[PDB]
Amino acid sequence: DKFLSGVVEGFYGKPWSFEQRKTLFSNMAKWGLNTYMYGPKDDEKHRAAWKQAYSKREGDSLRALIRAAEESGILFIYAISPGVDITYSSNRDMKFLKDKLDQIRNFGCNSFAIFFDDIDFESFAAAQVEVTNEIYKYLGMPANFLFCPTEYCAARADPNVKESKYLVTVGTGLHSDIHIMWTGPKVVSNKISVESILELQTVLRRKPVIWDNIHANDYEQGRLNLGPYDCRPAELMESLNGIFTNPNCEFELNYVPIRTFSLWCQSKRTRFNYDVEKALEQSIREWTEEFCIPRLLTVKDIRLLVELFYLPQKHGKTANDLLAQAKWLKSNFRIAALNTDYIAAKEWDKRFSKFRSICQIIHQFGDRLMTCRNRVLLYEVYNYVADLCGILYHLISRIHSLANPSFRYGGFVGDIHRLIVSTD
Amino acid sequence: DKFLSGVVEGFYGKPWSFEQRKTLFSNMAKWGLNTYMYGPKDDEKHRAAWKQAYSKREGDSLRALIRAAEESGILFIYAISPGVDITYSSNRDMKFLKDKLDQIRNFGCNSFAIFFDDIDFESFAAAQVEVTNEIYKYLGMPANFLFCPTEYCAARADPNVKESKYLVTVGTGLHSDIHIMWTGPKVVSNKISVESILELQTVLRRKPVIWDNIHANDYEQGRLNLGPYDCRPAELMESLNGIFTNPNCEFELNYVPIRTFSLWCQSKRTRFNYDVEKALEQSIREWTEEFCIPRLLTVKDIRLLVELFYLPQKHGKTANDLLAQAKWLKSNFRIAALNTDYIAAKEWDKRFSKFRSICQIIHQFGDRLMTCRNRVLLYEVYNYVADLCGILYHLISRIHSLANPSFRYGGFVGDIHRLIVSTD
């Protein structure tokens, strides 16, 4: 039990394929991080079909996945969410849990993760502690046994944030060799700090394991998190028993965030210094080297793509420059189509022609990305660039319509978005 | 040369697989429409690599695709876009065009479609007419030879809309057995009429073929067009030489628009009456019958899904009801948290609880759709429902925050969207 630094499949919608998970395991071996939790929402065998057992074909597929993870040199953690209605009462569903963990142990893996409310009331705390301790005693002593609480973030703890008493019950009543999952101050989890982890270490009397969601994208329309691993210090890695991350739903776009997270873990095993921009440019150089592979573009344009679709907490340099220029063209547009007023209109036309040149070069980047060698990495990235070029052309057309003397975009989702931004 | 009613691949990004095109051909055989134009943007052999030839493996794949279309009972039209810089001048690139059409004729197909500006200046009209007539004379007399002009819509004709003189040059100079592509009054092409097609038949002195884009979705973020085929009369089908349609980028979502278009063509071959709602409920019943297939939910919830992601020209009944209720809750929110004012606040709370019940039942529809048998049709539809549930919960949270005493969504695309809706 050294450190459980890995990548989960806690996102919704996409099942990653067997070769995608195999290349993920080989990337895990060559990068340094040594864990992989298996919680896919497409696989409903561990979520609601745990009363049922595993079949022959999907059992052999999971056995091949487990032995592929074993031969790659990483470890496999099977996350099963039966629900918070066990309470050790009837023990028929506890027998179903024991038979399910027996057949997963027959499939090859020995590490588990009991989930009650999966990270995306009352009188359940001591019952879930008893259920988790009886399951952990039934499996003897597994080396890496995880447990996700119902109040996995400070926004979900309803009595205050220090002592909601559910965290103190699962801190005192559970066995000391079981890890507790956590997310941070928020479920979306932007700008986390070591003080919340320190008071959680005070409450839980053990080091937790941070399920992170700084690269997750299932909760927003068109969000892509190709940004680096930022706003987490090295001492946050120091005061834990491991830290997982939830990447994007599309696998081939997750080269740069998993590589910056691998820098953030494996270089910090030796020395606690971390440069975000150096790891970002190293990951983007390795991503251009992976971009040239013809699996069925210079570094500057892919730097522009990474700096556009950044983290949810902060945009990139180019994105902030475009938002500042769009705000400047939107604010002082009354001097348009009109000595000092005429040169101010010429300055406004200079800024607007700079904006048109930015949309033209990002459309040329879209065509040059369309002429790529890799195609399965092309399709996962093309929709974001195409919709960005469309909304940037709509922005430029709106500014040009406001220059000289409705708007439907996004369908119903964009209609709801415009209905909650526009005021009375 | 009866009628070229078919489905194109003119969308961007997605290459449809061989089995997807095979099931598309079997659906084409069992529904009635008998054409398929091949213009995929992922295949750059016909767009810029037409100087190069076809390889052995992709040539055998195209030969298998052509013979699969032949054995299904439909016909195959190969669309090639060399560019508008031919002008019959050097004839080396004309020899490249002749060798490319020779190897496509060796692959099996005999129908073609010369494109100059693909539907998504000056002094080119008589040169492109000469190039198209020399190519059509080189191929003898193909039965179905198509030609897409540069000014394919009335919004692209720069001198007026009746006589831009490019349309009159390609109407008089071309051979009378060549069809001319058209889109309508707009490239996006909503609410088209028979009068524009009548004046185009006056100008072009032949019946055109309408490339339609009423179900296209590559040009907007999160747009899904699961709506029926609407706002096109039967006499529009009467005064043509065929009509194609551009469906969505995801293949398995295109059951209902291609089935309503198949109703709109094949039932109108016998009688020109068309019910939009009867064809919509027949296509949604056949889509539930296809929904139950376990290829790796009652009719009311899939009716709710189709009525949500409707056409770009008009929303459904449920979507208009939700927008009207959101506008009503947004408009008179000042009576909230406050005799007549108190019962008005209770009426406001009744409408807000109705809105919360609508978001709850659409999240339950999301979970019940997640428990489906088909998975490759699950993943193509899950992202739209998940982002709709997220933006509806954000709408309800904003209305509840406005009830009793920034906003980041979409990333950079949503930032541009909020920057072009919000005013000074």
Numbering used by the authors:
A (entry chain B), B (entry chain A): 4 to 123, 134 to 309, 352 to 393, 410 to 476, 489 to 507
Reported in the publication:
OGA is a homodimeric, multi-domain enzyme containing a catalytic core and a pseudo-histone acetyltransferase (pHAT) domain. In solution, OGA exist as flexible multi-domain dimers, but catalytic core-pHAT linker interactions restrict pHAT positional range.
To determine the spatial arrangement of the pHAT domains relative to the catalytic core, the full-length TaOGA structure was solved by cryo-EM. Initial 2D classification revealed a well-defined homodimeric catalytic core but lacked clear density for the pHAT domains. The dimerisation interface of TaOGA buries 2700 Å2 of the total 20,000 Å2 surface area, accounting for 14%, as calculated by the PISA server, which is 20% smaller than the reported value for the hOGA crystal structures. The top of the stalk domains of this TaOGA cryo-EM structure are in the same tight arrangement as in the hOGA catalytic core crystal structures, whereas one of the TaOGA catalytic domains rotates away from the neighbouring stalk domain, which is reflected in a pairwise inter-Cα distance of 33 Å in TaOGA (Lys59) and 40 Å in hOGA (Val113). Notably, several negative charges in the linker may contribute to electrostatic repulsion of these regions in the homodimer. Taken together, these data suggest that TaOGA, like hOGA, is a homodimer with dimerisation interfaces for the catalytic cores and pHAT domains, although the latter are averaged out due to the flexible linkers under conditions of the cryo-EM experiment. Notably, the linker connecting the catalytic core and the pHAT domain is smaller in TaOGA and not conserved between the two organisms, likely weakening the interaction between the catalytic core and the pHAT domains, resulting in no observed density for the pHAT domains in the cryo-EM structure of TaOGA.
